[PDB]
Design a protein around this ligand. Sequence first.
Ligand SMILES: CCCCCCCCCCCCCCCCCC(=O)OC[C@H](COP(=O)(O)OCCN)OC(=O)CCCCCCCCCCCCCCCCC
Ligand SMILES: CCCCCCCCCCCCCCCCCC(=O)OC[C@H](COP(=O)(O)OCCN)OC(=O)CCCCCCCCCCCCCCCCC
Ligand SMILES: CCCCCCCCCCCCCCCCCC(=O)OC[C@H](COP(=O)(O)OCCN)OC(=O)CCCCCCCCCCCCCCCCC
Ligand SMILES: CCCCCCCCCCCCCCCCCC(=O)OC[C@H](COP(=O)(O)OCCN)OC(=O)CCCCCCCCCCCCCCCCC
Ligand SMILES: CCCCCCCCCCCCCCCCCCCC
Ligand SMILES: CCCCCCCCCCCCCC
Lengths: 55, 478, 100, 504
Amino acid sequence: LLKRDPLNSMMNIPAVLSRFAGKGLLLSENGYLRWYVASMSIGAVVVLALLMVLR
Amino acid sequence: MTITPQNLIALLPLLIVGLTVVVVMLSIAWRRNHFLNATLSVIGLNAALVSLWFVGQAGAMDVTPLMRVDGFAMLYTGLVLLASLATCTFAYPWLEGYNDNKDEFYLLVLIAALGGILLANANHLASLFLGIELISLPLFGLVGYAFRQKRSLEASIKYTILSAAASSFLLFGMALVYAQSGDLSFVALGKNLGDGMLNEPLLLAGFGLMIVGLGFKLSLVPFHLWTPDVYQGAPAPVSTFLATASKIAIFGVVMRLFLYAPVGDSEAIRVVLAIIAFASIIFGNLMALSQTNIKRLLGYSSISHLGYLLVALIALQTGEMSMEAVGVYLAGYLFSSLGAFGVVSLMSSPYRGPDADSLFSYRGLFWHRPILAAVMTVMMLSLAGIPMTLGFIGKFYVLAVGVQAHLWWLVGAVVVGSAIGLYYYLRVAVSLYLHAPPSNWQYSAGGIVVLISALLVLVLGVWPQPLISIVRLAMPLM
Amino acid sequence: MIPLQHGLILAAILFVLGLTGLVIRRNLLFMLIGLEIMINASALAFVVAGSYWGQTDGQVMYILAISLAAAEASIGLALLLQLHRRRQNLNIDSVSEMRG
Amino acid sequence: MLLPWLILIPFIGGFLCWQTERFGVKVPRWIALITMGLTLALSLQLWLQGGYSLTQSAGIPQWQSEFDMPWIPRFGISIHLAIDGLSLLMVVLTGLLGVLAVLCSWKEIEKYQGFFHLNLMWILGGVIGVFLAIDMFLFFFFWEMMLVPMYFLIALWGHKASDGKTRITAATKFFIYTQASGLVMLIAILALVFVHYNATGVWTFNYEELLNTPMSSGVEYLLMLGFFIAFAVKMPVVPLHGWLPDAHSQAPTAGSVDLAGILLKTAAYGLLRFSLPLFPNASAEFAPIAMWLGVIGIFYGAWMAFAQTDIKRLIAYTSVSHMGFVLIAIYTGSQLAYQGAVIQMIAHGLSAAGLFILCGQLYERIHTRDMRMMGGLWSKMKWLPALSLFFAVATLGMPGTGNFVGEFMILFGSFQVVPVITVISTFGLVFASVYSLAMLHRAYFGKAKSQIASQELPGMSLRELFMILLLVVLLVLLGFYPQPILDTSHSAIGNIQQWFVNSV
Ligand SMILES: CCCCCCCCCCCCCCCCCC(=O)OC[C@H](COP(=O)(O)OCCN)OC(=O)CCCCCCCCCCCCCCCCC
Ligand SMILES: CCCCCCCCCCCCCCCCCC(=O)OC[C@H](COP(=O)(O)OCCN)OC(=O)CCCCCCCCCCCCCCCCC
Ligand SMILES: CCCCCCCCCCCCCCCCCC(=O)OC[C@H](COP(=O)(O)OCCN)OC(=O)CCCCCCCCCCCCCCCCC
Ligand SMILES: CCCCCCCCCCCCCCCCCC(=O)OC[C@H](COP(=O)(O)OCCN)OC(=O)CCCCCCCCCCCCCCCCC
Ligand SMILES: CCCCCCCCCCCCCCCCCCCC
Ligand SMILES: CCCCCCCCCCCCCC
């Protein structure tokens, strides 16, 4: 039962989480200029809303 | 305020770079001479770097309401001038293969360096806006210098559109801040409030729109998506300049704005910048895990390193050595990025078409270019924050600053992002030594520049006290 | 007897209209037009703020803003002409070959 | 005064190993041999001149030799080295294993062995610096600097049979584990320095000054946890162990990388030298968790060693089990258990070095490491199976070898402190005998299970036989006469134990 080293795989879990998160984050880099502008305006909305919430 | 002769002495690198712009442009008007115009540009940049000594002998003073010259301004002027000199040195062997006009490149580099010096000395919203624009527009030209290539043209279009959008965001935020405050000086942004009313909604909204513009300029999440495309599409010396000088100058003026403005210690702005720094570190490290392009990987790396710098920015009012940490980190980051992007530029020189930016092209670099491979693995170790490198000294400064101010979320983010960075930087540095299937003194000068950068990174990684003492000498007006 | 809030609101309305035009238009010329709208709106906001405080600094910032607008419009239209020369098409979605 | 040269002779020797390759391709091995022999001779001279047997416990700090130089005076950071009995034993073991690592890579005459020997000497100098540094920044600096040549040695000079991607993956996993844990330790160091600065007002990274640092319970627990996370990664302590069999399996086939910077127990030394004295109350509350982690390490490593089909992975998991014993010993607060831990560290270094060198020689002979492809190798080789039998007898803790002295003194002191953990650990000794006999029967006894094991094989040469027999003699002498080793470390161990139990 132990010959596959289960604790090693349990500690390898954060590596696969990092791989999955990086692959998900790379979807935002689609190369489209209009999406880059839209993401800038989304970030503007988020920053402004956060500043008004914690004012 | 008027301009005095001692103010003109404090004006010296700006005046010298402007005179170099005029002289190089008149020399181009005389005759197109690549060697002569490149030599005149580097002579002017070296003269400004030397005249920093006379600026230091003059002392710290206010030159007009727009500028304040001190040791901080001198250090950032020196960093900008070093990056510009390296950019010209890498530009010449690349431009030797350029069939169209090559002389305009040095003119654009000089004007961008002028913008960097203005941002180093900026004490005013007008000078901050003008310095950002003076950096950005020559970079619009430089990123699309090889506009016949589709990647360079696409990168130029993306950078121009997004930087115009960010400039309009920053100017609207400046206008809202001015409407609240009634003064565009840095020290007056929040001065007309008291009794715990620093979080005025219009002042905070204006500073948020300025944060949008500046965080575009610093590739901070979520204004970061332009960075790998523009870094990849630009010419490699342009990528060197954009990675070093623009980021360093804009972060220096952000440092000074948050140090001087009474609204800089607002808790809402601090929390928003903490979120941005956390997301920048994590996202920039995570997106570079699976990059087969060295320039895109360096773009995501730049996002993460500016996140670390922003972590040092957050502890500006809490701790005592935030500015010293930022100076040490920026010196180390300048040398590491200069070496890495210079190895990329020398591998892409002379210009023939598409850039040599695939990781398969750098696989087995040691078997034909051993010195360049040694320099590149030193820079990959430095950007990972490995000891006996200056990048580790910068990371140690960032960690000490975060621990002192009890920014535990940011400290944990730095540790996790450092582990992710370890993975991809080691992948590049060890792919350099695997197995895979010039001849003029300007290329040798570029190789000497990257070798000197590697030697400085190693020596100041082992012995960082001279750099620490230099940065501690270069202190702004309290 | 003009409230400063009304001028700032008019400037903000023009700014978000220009940003909307920047996002929703695939043609690069309309993107540049939206950029001109946003920078003109920010310059208007500076003029309103300078007029409220009785200072020349608002009009000075306006002057710097329109200098930026002129130079940026020049560069953007040069890039548009280059895109039309090398593509015969001004669709900004076509310049997307760098991604990931 | 000789401690800077104890660090610098490996570094200058590695530089000379790289530089002398133009004089010939058989030159850098001689330079590395003279370098490590000079380091070992300096360590032995320090042992003779130290007078460690007559040294009494005077309390921390108590150094037989000391060196100080300012390095980064802005933060109060110094090149601060100090030697006492425990660090002296560790440095002597490092020099001996470095000489063995040079001698084991004697036949590698490739075109870039100057860089190989430079990396080996830089690893050994970093290990010596870890054992000598009593400045926390300098200790961390050595702790992290000795992993870069480790990474490059595994990645470029590693197991040639495996694909390059496997070597890159194992090297990267090892580097990420060790460096991320080191960064957590750096966070703990920085927070301790800031607590001391807030309490007093001066900038210091000196371990002697940081000993008297008043802090609340909960802060001290977190600093202890950061230190323990670094040490637990490098010890290894389960579940932070998975890098170790991968790094061993992809290390260079002779095993100089195995000896040079894996089989030197810097983490147990760090727990004894830094974790217990800086955070005695936090370590006292953490003791049950650490002891149960050690118990789990003993049994988990034994079961993993039994389940292996590769010999190198088997020996790596034996290292996991024995370090579980040492981890149990460290948190007892018993002088007898601490002395047993010192003996166990030295004896495990010797026995695992012998096992890894013999495995490298066996792989040179038969070109495979899977035990299912061998068997009956006693009748085919001249010296190797009998020496492997002796070393397997050593790692099960047979009396007459130093391993028995080590873990039995550990168990005596631990039973004086914690009986239940002790009895479970002795059943761990039964498990150790099981895995050692299993490896012996799979490799050397029975009949041949493939074609390579059915033919006569060339015998060991004089150099390999000399180094293996030297390890045999040292292990037997440690088993029958461990008193000079106990007398060397008696004062330092007593100081650490008295500090641990007088502040709790
Ligand atoms: C082929 C041709 C080649 C030509 C040479 C090119 C390479 C060399 C370039 C040399 C540039 C020299 C610049 C010297 C700046 C400092 C001059 C000086 O005297 O500073 C002293 C001053 C404080 O001293 P004091 O004079 O007493 O102050 C009175 C004013 N209140 O100090 C200050 O006020 C602030 C001092 C620090 C300012 C920053 C330092 C200058 C910029 C450095 C950028 C790089 C830093 C990182 C790398 C460091 C490597 C060690
Ligand atoms: C006691 C627990 C708390 C304290 C922990 C202290 C930290 C040190 C000890 C734990 C370290 C755990 C590291 C786990 C990953 C090890 C590295 C690794 O596996 O690298 C190999 C892998 C690439 O190899 P392969 O699987 O072939 O992938 C090819 C994909 N096409 O590489 C990759 O896939 C990329 C790996 C990127 C980096 C890994 C993620 C690091 C995240 C932060 C780690 C810090 C601790 C976080 C909490 C741990 C769990 C509690
Ligand atoms: C992902 C890997 C890395 C892990 C994440 C990064 C580290 C996270 C650390 C979280 C720390 C939470 C602290 C919560 C309390 C803070 C407020 C407080 O109570 O401050 C008290 C004190 C300041 O007041 P003072 O006058 O100094 O009091 C004397 C007490 N000594 O405060 C102090 O004196 C400072 C207390 C500092 C405590 C130690 C912090 C670092 C400890 C080592 C690393 C964390 C533990 C190991 C890793 C866990 C698993 C990953
Ligand atoms: C990409 C995804 C994957 C990668 C990233 C994964 C996540 C990374 C981050 C992991 C770490 C999270 C934070 C852990 C530290 C939390 C600290 C904390 O909560 O401190 C609160 C408190 C502070 O102390 P305080 O009460 O202020 O003291 C003064 C009163 N005398 O503390 C106390 O009072 C004492 C608390 C003691 C225990 C705190 C630490 C728990 C750590 C759990 C794991 C380790 C368990 C032990 C070791 C096991 C073997 C390694
Ligand atoms: C660090 C490596 C240690 C290896 C094991 C060494 C064990 C000690 C051996 C000492 C010598 C024993 C035989 C000679 C005894 C001489 C007694 C002299 C006084 C009567
Ligand atoms: C991905 C990085 C995770 C880092 C986690 C850090 C947690 C810090 C918690 C601090 C709690 C303080 C309570 C007073």
